Design a binder for this molecule. Structure first.
Ligand SMILES: O=c1[nH]cnc2c1ncn2[C@@H]1O[C@H](COP(=O)(O)O)[C@@H](O)[C@H]1O
Ligand SMILES: O=c1[nH]cnc2c1ncn2[C@@H]1O[C@H](COP(=O)(O)O)[C@@H](O)[C@H]1O
Ligand SMILES: O=CN(O)CC(=O)O
Ligand SMILES: O=CN(O)CC(=O)O
Lengths: 431, 431
């Protein structure tokens, strides 16, 4: 399919950046349909790293026009930050990148708010990345926010800005007893980058309609993961946007009927950053082993990531939700050395029932325990293996049972962080 | 296609209820994927009216399970209100209707907030329906809201409720100098309907996955219209959810790849309720004629609706956005008697350019004027005509040029408010 969707089947941090960069070879466009700079999509070409946060993972490819769609909450400061960094490394970000005038803006006050609300939660803190994501999405739905296109008239912007900040500060100071963030300062910072963004502005939905009509290879890149969906996730321990493929047509403008292949990025084991349910969570050396080996530390915050065995149940939901066409198995080599391996095949409900369906809101997950199928590990090395013939029978079996369990094929297998340390058993643009 | 989407191509009030009720004949399920009780979907069977607001338009059909998906913001009070009304007329609402535990709740404080913010806008008021829609969607994205599933434990609910209201009231009283809405009262009202909703709760996304796998006829019903989309609409004069087909997979849980046919409901002329851009707006007898004849008055508020000629440009956007498979032409008989007819074929930009693409945010629409193609009307009557042979050549021509202009076929033509006063030139479930 020309229009391929690559998204996180778990809780984010499955390894999407690498796959977007990988598959972008034949693509003319890469589009982010949601999230913000809360992400940390890491690219490694020949061993040279690049951590992307807001910038689409097709930024290091001459042929690709990277696009930040309307669904995405844009932080002027972060964008400017990333560009220079890439520009200093030979990537003409401004010739490659495009953005929607529809994109919500994230400003100083959104972070202050993001932090007050979090603190306000005491023990019940979500573990948000503290980037004003939550608040930015709020102001939007409220029809009170600033989008990219408001910079079109700096006069009315400053007026609109004064009004909105006037409002937020009363709450910051008067309710949260927090300091007020200054209007003139945020104004000054904003209006100093205004001209840049506005020049990257294009009609994204009309744009993609033309590519589709011509048959161009479009790649929509997701951030976060299925279980962090604002609707379908473990509410309220979720992100503020829709991380399920449906957010593709809403935050890009593409016809829902034009999505061709939904590629699910599946890490060989689970991880979570931020508070929230996680059945297959391990608190033993096996879980610490995964931490040290998969190098599970937040790429935006640097927070230690919680680890666990693969959960085919939370995954099976992701499957149905995104109409996944196939999987890309990431970090399988992190399993090397393990004796026994475990996938979660079902959940034991607190009332004694056994189910193969996940609960919904965070509360509903309470006494839910995991049922596993233990499998033999493999001492052999898997790192860098670019073919199955090099994958040991166990590894191969683990993979197959996963397909069997989910009914979805492991189309690509990633055996290392570098672009080349991978296997494409089926190409999404082909099949 | 089994999975048919029926949505508003304009600004809502195109006549969706009637088409949902119409086409539901072979459907097992009807799903609302967004909106709230801000809608007013009117059904007329043999001349008997039923105004639906939150209840899906497949509620008067024995064979159909009506579903209110997770995208929908649910007002406990409105639901209870509608049910009794239908129950008093022989519709066993509780045996027919199902709802998602994921659904956001709308309470007293959301309306108070909705009204303060509106007032707060002075002249720049949006013209919201004042049903707490805006605020309900806000609390959700904020991860501070109450969803249906919180009623699962009334103890923690009351606690969660106390906290949220505690917060809103400080702003109502302290900022907006408005009265505080009482916690115990809202608690009392809520907990008095708690058991009803919770018994209609089902797993909607898992549910629809099974129907899809079996090949059931599913009907997703939209509310509002394409130009009221929170992202793609005339921001901030929009609604707080996504009225484009992409909101189908996000507020239902259906795989974006499972939508089969997007049916666009197109009224023969335009209308708008609430503030906002409307190029083809008429302020002359022709525009008043349409008002009196199409009986254009808000079905939720009873507000006089603004009228205008058909705008193929605002429509052409809707087309691309929703990947429309076809159109259903509504209210064509309202045109009877007119001498000349006019469709908007392009816009004259304020800088002198001529475009066939619509601007985005409300501001961007400023000096935008419409370019028309005038056509001969028809004195003949069109009301009740169930076939083309009865449609006069002019009418027929108006229809064809519309297809030509948009590149999408008028699959169904509605010649009156009653279920039977229609024409299905192509059935969506068939083709
Ligand atoms: O890209 C990400 N990867 C993993 N977790 C994330 C990512 N972005 C946000 N989160 C989680 O999203 C939740 C809410 O934070 P938000 O994105 O800051 O609004 C917390 O559990 C965050 O850790
Ligand atoms: O179903 C509807 N039909 C037509 N206009 C609507 C409908 N629902 C909301 N609106 C418009 O939506 C805008 C914002 O109001 P909201 O839906 O109250 O949040 C105003 O222009 C409303 O008139
Ligand atoms: O790659 C992104 N991170 O792991 C999320 C974070 O640091 O919060
Ligand atoms: O049918 C719904 N109305 O026209 C909207 C309203 O009354 O605001």
């Amino acid at each position: 399919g020309n229009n391929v969707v690559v998204l996180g089947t778990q809780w984010g941090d499955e390894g999407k950046g690498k796959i977007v960069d990988l598959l972008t070879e034949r693509a003319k466009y890469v589009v982010r349909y949601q999230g913000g700079h809360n992400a940390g999509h890491t690219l490694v070409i020949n061993g040279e790293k690049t951590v992307l946060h807001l910038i689409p993972s097709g930024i290091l490819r001459e042929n690709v026009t990277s696009i930040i769609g309307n669904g995405v909450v844009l932080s002027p400061a972060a964008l400017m930050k990333e560009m220079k960094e890439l520009e200093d490394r030979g990537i003409p970000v401004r010739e490659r990148l495009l953005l929607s005038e529809a994109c919500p803006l994230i400003l100083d006050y959104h972070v202050a708010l993001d932090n007050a609300r979090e603190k306000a939660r005491g023990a019940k803190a979500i573990g948000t990345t503290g980037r004003g994501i939550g608040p930015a999405y709020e102001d939007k739905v409220a029809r009170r926010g600033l989008r990219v296109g408001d910079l079109f008239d700096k006069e009315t912007f400053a007026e609109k800005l004064k009004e909105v900040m006037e409002y937020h500060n009363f709450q910051l100071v008067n309710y949260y007893k927090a300091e007020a963030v200054d209007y003139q300062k945020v104004l000054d910072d904003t209006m100093a980058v205004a001209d840049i963004l506005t020049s990257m502005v294009v009609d994204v939905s009309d744009l993609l309609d033309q590519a589709r009509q011509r048959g161009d290879f479009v790649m929509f890149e997701g951030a976060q993961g299925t279980l962090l969906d604002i609707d379908h996730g473990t509410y309220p321990y979720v992100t503020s946007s829709n991380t399920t493929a449906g957010g593709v047509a809403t935050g890009s403008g593409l016809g829902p009927r034009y999505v061709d292949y939904v590629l699910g990025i599946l890490k060989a084991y689970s991880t979570r950053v931020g508070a929230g349910p996680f059945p297959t969570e391990l608190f033993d050396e096996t879980g610490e082993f995964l931490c040290k080996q998969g190098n599970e530390f937040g790429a935006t915050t640097g927070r230690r990531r919680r680890t666990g065995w693969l959960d085919t149940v939370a995954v099976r939901r992701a499957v149905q939700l995104n109409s996944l066409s196939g999987f890309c198995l990431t970090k399988l080599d992190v399993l090397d050395g393990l004796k026994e391996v475990k996938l979660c095949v079902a959940y034991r409900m607190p009332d004694g029932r056994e189910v193969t369906t996940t609960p919904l809101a965070a509360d509903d997950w309470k006494g839910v325990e995991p049922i596993y199928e233990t499998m033999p590990g493999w001492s052999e090395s898997t790192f860098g293996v670019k073919d199955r013939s090099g994958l040991p029978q166990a590894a191969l079996n683990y993979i197959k049972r996963i397909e069997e369990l989910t009914g979805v094929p492991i189309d690509i297998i990633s055996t290392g962080p570098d672009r080349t340390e991978t296997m494409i058993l089926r190409d999404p643009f082909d099949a």
